[PDB]
């Protein structure tokens, strides 16, 4: 008699979470873990926290209490004191006692998974955002013994190495950039994975894996990730990294003598990078992130141009500026296409005689017309209200890490030197890259702006706002990203610089640039 067997229950996963100074990331990080599409009754939690300067253990304790009954089991190993290691130089310094402790901890979680008869153990670093709720299911689907999902960072850094040096050190290989950029998809054999990975405790070879102590043959640096990677070689366990689709994001590690504020702002940029192409990563419905209070970054006004019909560009920028604690005045963009020929003449608008597109040879467009009038209105607002220094934003731009501190420290450097400036580029397209642009003395990270090509973000002074308006550019209409290089006298074509007489604009540019385009 045939009788159908019911389905197998999902694999039994232990999620091991080591947390130190993670209160900045846990609301977003733990919310992502809650919403993993894996049955919570087939999931167990293992949490260890210690050496905390922030209220990391308090956030964890509240979250665990809220989700304890949903899971197969929960282990909780806090240690309030000491808040820092006796042999450390700072919270971001990986001393030997911190290496040893974290190794011992991962080993304890590994043993705990073995003792509770779990199929898999999943390590997730407290600052690792597992955005894809299917990541755990997808990693189980690969039937590997140690597999890791390639997480995206702001740079080439990711949670895997492509080469090793037979001494344990990092090593670039030609295949890293292809894997990193997902040009080659799949799962690849690599000598190193870290941060987040899945161990298959069904595999018999996993019984020989060990986070601590180092293997008896280990003769490398006292590094936690190196000790484990060497343990996979001895057990002949091939580590794999998969990039078949997007899984999550992670911040790039900081230097030893960095600070907790660096780390909190570093993870905030991760949230920004997510919001470039995704909705904002939501927090847990049981953890609440602290309320932020913004400012104008010491400016007289921070503008943001936006066309009302581009509603999704508006919400994205407001979420990004809010997350960076930056306040803006929304300026309605001049819809250049909605202006008939009569309203164009009503403002004395005439294209510059003989203008041709640098890459197609076309006259000025209605889009570039409405774009020039948008910046033209802001220049009018600057002169009317007498704002001495203002920052101007557009609606499609991504922010660099530590954007707020980095620009504010330039503005306190430009001010302390009494620089006679009109236009400071926060984001442009540098067109003169043969010889380097002349650096501005006594003001670090600032150069004299040569021929640029964009107006994504810039600082303008009241002096510069009058200079632009006094050149009456409405009758000599030229796209705004070319009219500015005409005003500081670095435009390549001289048939354009001839129509404008006085071109005494003091233009500078932040170096490196603090803002880039979204879709480049």
**Of 8-16, 164-172, 399-407, 424-432: span binding a second copy (CB under 8 A):** 8-16
Nearest residue (CB) to a second copy, 186 versus 358: 186
Question: Would you count residue 155 as binding a second copy (CB under 8 A)?
Answer: no
What Å distances lie between residue 116 and 41, 201, 428, 467, CA to CA? 14, 11, 57, 74
User: Minimal CA–CA distance to 148: which of 37, 247, 31?
Assistant: 247
Q: Give the whole-angstrom CA distance, residue 36 versus residue 128.
A: 14
Q: Is 6 in the site for a second copy (CB under 8 A)?
A: yes
Rounded Cα–Cα distance for residues 482 and 511 (Å): 20
Residue 338 interacts with, from Cl ion, a second copy, Ca ion, none (CB under 5-8 Å by kind): none
Q: Is residue 429 involved in binding a second copy (CB under 8 A)?
A: no
Check: CB of residue 19 under 8 Å from CB of residue 48.
yes
What residue ranges in 261-399 does DSSP mark as E strands? Answer: 301-306, 329-332, 389-393, 398-399
Task: State how far the alpha carbon of 232 is from the alpha carbons of 207, 226, 235, 509, in Å.
Answer: 11, 10, 5, 49
Is residue 321 close enough to count as binding Cl ion by CB under 5 A? yes
For residue 286, state whether it binds Cl ion (rule: CB under 5 A).
no
Q: Please pick, from the candidates 257, 285, 366, 444, the single residue that binds Cl ion as defined by CB under 5 A.
A: 257
Q: Does 113 bind Hg ion (CB under 5 A)?
A: no
54 lies in the binding site for ligand GDU (CB under 6 A)? no
Q: C-beta of 17: minimal distance to ligand GDU in Å?
A: 7
Binding to Cl ion, residues 328-387 (CB under 5 A): 328
* Closer to Ca ion by Cβ: residue 103 or 352: 103
Contact residues: Ca ion, CB under 5 A: 125, 127
User: Is-contact 339 369, C-beta < 8 A?
Assistant: yes
Residue 68 has a CB neighbour count (10 Å cut-off) of: 12
Specify the DSSP class assigned to residue 493.
Answer: -
Selection from Cl ion, a second copy, Hg ion, none that 76 binds (CB < 5 to 8 A by kind) is Cl ion
136 part of the interface to Hg ion, by CB under 5 A: no
CA-to-CA dists, residue 488 to 97, 122, 448, 464, 506, angstroms: 57, 57, 10, 10, 6
126/199 with CB nearer ligand GDU: 126
Q: Closer to Cl ion at the Cβ: 5 or 183?
A: 183
Task: Indicate which of Cl ion, Ca ion, a second copy, none lies near residue 321 (CB less than 5 to 8 Å, by partner kind).
Answer: Cl ion
The DSSP line for 375-443 is HHHHHHHHHHHT-SEEEEE-SS-EEPTTHHHHHHHHHHHHHHTT---SEEEEE------SSPPPBPTTS
Total residues at interface with a second copy (CB under 8 A): 27
Tell whether residue 76 is a contact of Cl ion (CB under 5 A): yes
For residue 337, count CB atoms less than 10 angstroms from its CB and return exposed for 0-12, middle for 13-18, buried for 19 or more: exposed
127 touches ligand GDU (CB under 6 A): yes
236 binds a second copy (CB under 8 A): yes
257 or 412, CB closer to Cl ion? Answer: 257
Q: For ligand GDU, which residue has the nearest CB?
A: 253
Work out whether 162 is an interface residue with Hg ion (CB under 5 A): yes
CA distance 464 to 470: 10
- As a whole number of Å, the end-to-end CA separation of the chain is 65
Which stretches of the chain bind a second copy, using CB under 8 A?
1, 3, 5-9, 12, 72, 116-118, 143-145, 188-189, 200, 202-207, 236-238
Which stretches of the chain bind ligand GDU, using CB under 6 A?
18-20, 22, 49-51, 94, 98, 101-102, 125-127, 194-195, 224-225, 253
């Amino acid at each position: 008699r045939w009788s159908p067997e019911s389905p197998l229950q999902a694999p039994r996963v232990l999620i091991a979470l080591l947390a130190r100074n993670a209160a900045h990331a846990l609301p977003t990080t733990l919310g992502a873990l809650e919403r993993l599409r894996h049955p919570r009754e087939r999931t167990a939690l293992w949490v260890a926290t210690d050496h905390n300067m922030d209220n990391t253990s308090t956030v964890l304790r509240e979250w665990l209490v809220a989700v304890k009954s949903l899971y197969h089991s929960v282990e909780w190993r806090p240690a309030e004191e000491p808040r820092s290691y006796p042999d450390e130089e700072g919270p971001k310094h990986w001393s030997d006692s911190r290496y040893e402790h974290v190794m011992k901890l991962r080993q304890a979680a590994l043993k705990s998974a073995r003792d509770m008869w779990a199929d898999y153990i999943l390590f997730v670093d407290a600052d690792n955002l597992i955005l894809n709720p299917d990541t755990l299911s997808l990693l189980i689907a690969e039937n590997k013994t140690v597999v890791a999902p390639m997480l995206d960072s702001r740079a080439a850094y990711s949670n895997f190495w492509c080469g090793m040096t037979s001494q344990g050190y990092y090593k670039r290989t030609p295949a890293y950039i292809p894997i990193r950029k997902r040009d080659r998809r799949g799962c690849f054999a690599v000598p190193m994975v870290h941060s987040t990975f899945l161990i298959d405790l069904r595999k018999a070879a996993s019984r020989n894996l060990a986070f601590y102590p180092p293997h008896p043959d280990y003769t490398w640096s006292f590094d936690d990730i190196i000790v484990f990677a060497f343990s996979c070689k001895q057990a002949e366990v091939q580590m794999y990294v998969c990039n078949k689709e997007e899984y999550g994001f992670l911040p790039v590690p900081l230097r030893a003598h960095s600070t907790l504020q660096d780390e909190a702002e570093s993870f905030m940029h991760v949230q920004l990078e997510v919001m470039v192409k995704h909705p904002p990563a939501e927090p847990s419905r049981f953890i609440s992130a602290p309320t932020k209070t913004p400012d104008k970054m010491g400016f007289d006004e921070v503008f943001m141009i936006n066309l009302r019909r581009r509603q999704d560009r508006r919400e994205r920028m407001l979420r990004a500026l809010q997350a960076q604690e930056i306040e803006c005045r929304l300026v309605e963009a001049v819809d250049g296409k909605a202006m008939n020929t009569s309203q164009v003449e009503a403002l004395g608008i005439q294209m510059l005689p003989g203008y041709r597109d640098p890459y197609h040879g076309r006259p000025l467009t209605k889009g570039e017309l409405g774009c020039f009038l948008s910046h033209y209105n802001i220049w009018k607002e600057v002169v009317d209200r007498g704002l001495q220094k203002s920052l101007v934003f557009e609606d499609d731009l991504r922010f660099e890490i530590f954007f707020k501190r980095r620009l504010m420290n330039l503005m306190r450097d430009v001010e302390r030197e009494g620089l006679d400036w009109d236009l400071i580029y926060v984001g442009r397209k540098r067109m003169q890259v043969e010889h380097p642009e002349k650096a501005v003395p006594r003001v670090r990270n600032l150069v004299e702006a040569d021929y640029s090509y964009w107006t994504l973000a810039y600082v303008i002074s009241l002096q510069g706002a009058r200079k632009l308006l006094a050149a009456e550019p409405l009758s000599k209409m030229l796209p705004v990203d070319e009219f500015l290089p005409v005003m500081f006298d670095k435009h390549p074509v001289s048939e354009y610089k001839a129509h404008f007489s006085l071109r005494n604009l003091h233009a500078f540019s932040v170096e490196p640039l603090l803002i880039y385009p979204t879709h480049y």
